[PDB]
């Protein structure tokens, strides 16, 4: 009973989040945003590939769910189930509305036409900008061709134009890959979970001496 995605492709309205004013919103189709070995440390998956949108548009929660599954199946096939970690980086926080008309042979039955036309919550979409990252995959450095192909397949589930980009950052961190190792060597970066903690050279020295001890 869902409308074609072309009806809600463009960011035509102001953001309409689920809040105390917008009640009765059905849950989004996508509930999981990280897959693969999420517990892998930062050094395990140095290579990171992104899907980047070229279009300012809206992506439905169903499309994000479809592309997440499509990329997951191929990575599991090509890199094993523990050889990657995917992060969907768009959350469907914008609610789209439908002004539902009775699909019967009669406007006499209180179709009401365009009177009181403000619609009811019908779904949730994610608003994406040009240059924004839709999906991210981190894995080992020999799986680059599998990351590109997996992201290429997931592009077919999306309305507009998307670009595949191999980032120069190390994994999911915000630090460059070529400066990553020596920054850990000089303890500017400390690993935790799947990310790193930047340690600035300020604050109490007591935290400086727990490092170097």
């Amino acid at each position: 009973g869902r409308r074609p995605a072309r009806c809600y492709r463009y960011c035509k309205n102001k953001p309409y989040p689920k809040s105390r004013f917008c009640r009765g919103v059905p849950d989004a189709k996508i509930r999981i945003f990280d897959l693969g070995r999420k517990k892998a440390k930062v050094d395990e998956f140095p290579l990171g590939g992104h899907m980047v949108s070229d279009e300012y548009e809206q992506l439905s929660s169903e499309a994000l769910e479809a592309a997440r599954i499509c990329a997951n199946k191929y990575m599991v096939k090509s890199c094993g189930r523990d050889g990657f970690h995917m992060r969907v980086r768009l959350h469907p926080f914008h609610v789209i509305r439908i002004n539902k008309m009775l699909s019967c042979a009669g406007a006499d039955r209180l179709q009401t036409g365009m009177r009181g036309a403000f619609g009811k919550p019908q779904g949730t979409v994610a608003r994406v900008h040009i240059g924004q990252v839709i999906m991210s995959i981190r894995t080992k450095l020999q799986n680059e061709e599998h990351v590109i192909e997996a992201l290429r397949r997931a592009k077919f589930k999306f309305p507009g134009r998307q670009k595949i980009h191999i980032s120069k950052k190390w994994g999911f961190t915000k630090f460059n890959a070529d400066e990553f190792e020596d920054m850990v060597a000089k303890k500017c970066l400390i690993p935790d979970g799947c990310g790193v903690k930047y340690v600035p050279s300020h604050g109490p020295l007591d935290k400086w001496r727990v490092l170097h001890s």
Binding site: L205, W208, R209, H212, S213
Partner: protein, 293 residues
């Protein structure tokens, strides 16, 4: 750690400190606004107020008016200059509060040149007195009492300072409800036990009271009264002579003192280079201690 830290980073980022003198617990800005602010249609006419502050060991009486750059004090009187005439012991009491309030009144009137007019109530009686301006003469000085944070119950020493000033010649609006002679149940001002408080007879009775029950307790309480022999029977005459001496010479002279060196007693603020050197040394010492193992 099992409970959210209330004073986290976000708590200090949104924290709005109060006014400095509000944080110090010295100024009630709710009362100050109603005391210092002049009507806009009176323009730069000063609004005077009698500041009375009773300290553990001193009484401070000041007359000031507000200006944007800060309060301007036109005359001040202290209870520590009371020993210049008569009363040298038993300061910061009700009798000394009357004396310093009277001294402030006489000193201010002397500076303005209005001593002969507005003598005030020379003969000390506790009854209500209010000075009236004399026609053809400059008007009586009008000011208002600034009690501060003191609890203004009946018998407060700030009203003793007010009584001394109004008897000195200053026109301060007031009532007798807060004088020691006021009776709560009968709603009657005795005006005679108030005069006894002004003359320190309550203290004088206490000295002769303690003499008859416990001698050493009397010596503990009135130890400095024993020095120079201030006895209960001479207290009223001591205060009368003090009042008369205040009337005769209220002018204040200051002790000169310039034969002082620049001795600095506070540690100066450390420079940026010293702070970094200290961090560098502490870093080096920690590493060096590690190589000892």
């Amino acid at each position: 750690g099992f409970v959210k830290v209330v004073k986290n980073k976000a708590y200090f980022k949104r924290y709005q400190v109060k006014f400095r003198r509000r944080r110090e617990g010295k100024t009630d800005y709710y009362a100050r606004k109603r005391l210092v602010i002049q009507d806009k249609n009176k323009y730069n006419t000063p609004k005077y107020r009698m500041i009375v502050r009773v300290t553990n060991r001193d009484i401070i009486c000041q007359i000031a008016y507000a200006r944007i750059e800060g309060d301007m004090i036109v005359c001040a009187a202290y209870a520590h200059e009371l020993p210049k005439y008569g009363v040298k012991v038993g300061l910061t009491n009700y009798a000394a509060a009357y004396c310093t309030g009277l001294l402030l009144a006489r000193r201010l009137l002397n500076r303005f040149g209005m001593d002969k007019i507005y003598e005030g109530q020379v003969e000390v009686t506790g009854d209500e007195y209010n000075v009236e301006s004399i026609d053809g003469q400059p008007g009586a000085f009008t000011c208002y009492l600034d009690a501060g944070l003191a609890r203004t119950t009946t018998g407060n020493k700030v009203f003793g300072a007010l009584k001394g000033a109004v008897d000195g010649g200053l026109s301060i609006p007031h009532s007798t409800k807060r004088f020691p002679g006021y009776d709560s149940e009968s709603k009657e001002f005795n005006a005679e036990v108030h005069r006894k408080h002004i003359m320190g007879q309550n203290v004088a009775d206490y000295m002769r009271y303690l003499m008859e029950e416990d001698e050493d307790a009397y010596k503990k309480q009135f130890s400095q009264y024993i020095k120079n022999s201030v006895t209960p029977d001479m207290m009223e005459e001591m205060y009368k002579k003090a009042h008369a001496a205040i009337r005769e010479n209220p002018v204040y002279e200051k002790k000169p003192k310039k034969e002082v060196k620049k001795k600095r007693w506070n540690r100066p603020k450390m420079s940026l280079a010293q702070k970094k050197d200290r961090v560098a040394q502490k870093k080096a010492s920690f590493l060096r201690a590690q190589e000892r193992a």
